């Protein structure tokens, strides 16, 4: 299947409550495998998936050194961005970074990613070409000029096409029993009368991995997009995810509705109905 590696960094200032917190998490698909938190009693890169534990001492020391350097760099970036936006020293601000690589089903690089946000708004992003930038505003253009002068895009391209892809392939092999195992959803339809006139039909998908799924209701073979209440896919806490889609149907008309399930772990897409 298709796989990706992503790192998510968040630096948050908190004036009057010490220096900005820096947190980094690493994921392979929907599985987190590392964390670093500058607010931990003894900040260090910690394993969060069993297959990463086999990495040696140099791995944990090297990752810690990088995240500790990033902690200092991001506190400087927060100071710079407060000035680029003429903001007072009173408020709390957040910088976020996401980056990583996507591989196709053959293990070949599909594309790289490297983007940033300031206070939850897009700030700067490395374009798909891994050579040019898209700045959201005149403040991000200052960062773009600094990064263009320092050949940052060239270093990121080298990482995204090289080390990102090599480490992702290694993690995929080390954790092949889980990372490369798609667990299909366990599916069922529940019926809940709302009144004498209507009932809710709820189509459940439980125990699936990865998180990507498609769950829809059709009425006489027609998509009920506007009438379906679709909850966000949510983690069960054991690596798996859950999701449901609900439609309110007139009493007696339940057999006109079918629930449709698409998931990587399903050989063929499922069609379910309420089974009274």
């Amino acid at each position: 299947g298709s796989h990706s590696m992503r790192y998510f960094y968040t630096a948050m200032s908190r004036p009057g409550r010490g220096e900005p917190r820096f947190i980094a998490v690493g994921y392979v698909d929907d599985t987190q495998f590392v964390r670093f938190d500058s607010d931990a009693a003894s900040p260090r890169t910690e394993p969060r998936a069993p297959w990463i534990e086999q990495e040696g001492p140099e791995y944990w020391d090297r990752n810690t050194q990088i995240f500790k350097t990033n902690t200092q760099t991001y506190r400087e970036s927060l100071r710079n961005l407060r000035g680029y936006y003429n903001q007072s020293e009173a408020g709390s601000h957040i910088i976020q970074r996401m980056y990583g690589c996507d591989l196709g089903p053959d293990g070949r690089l599909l594309r790289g990613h490297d983007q940033f946000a300031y206070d939850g708004k897009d700030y700067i992003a490395l374009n798909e070409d891994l050579s040019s930038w898209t700045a959201a505003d005149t403040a991000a253009q200052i960062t773009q000029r600094k990064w263009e002068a320092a050949r940052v895009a060239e270093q990121l391209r080298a990482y995204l096409e090289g080390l990102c892809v090599e480490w992702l392939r290694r993690y995929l092999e080390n954790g092949k029993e889980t990372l490369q195992r798609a667990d299909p959803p366990k599916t069922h339809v529940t019926h809940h009368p709302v009144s004498d006139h209507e009932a809710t039909l709820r189509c459940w998908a439980l125990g699936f991995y990865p998180a990507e799924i498609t769950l829809t209701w059709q009425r006489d073979g027609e998509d009920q997009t506007q009438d379906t209440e679709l909850v966000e896919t949510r983690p069960a806490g054991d690596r798996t995810f859950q999701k449901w889609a609900a439609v309110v149907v007139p009493s007696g008309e339940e057999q006109r509705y079918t629930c449709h399930v698409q998931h990587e772990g399903l050989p063929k897409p499922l069609t379910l109905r309420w089974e009274p």
Partner: peptide, 8 residues
């Protein structure tokens, strides 16, 4: 493994 590439 993370990258080792900067202040804004």
């Amino acid at each position: 493994n993370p990258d080792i590439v900067y202040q804004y």
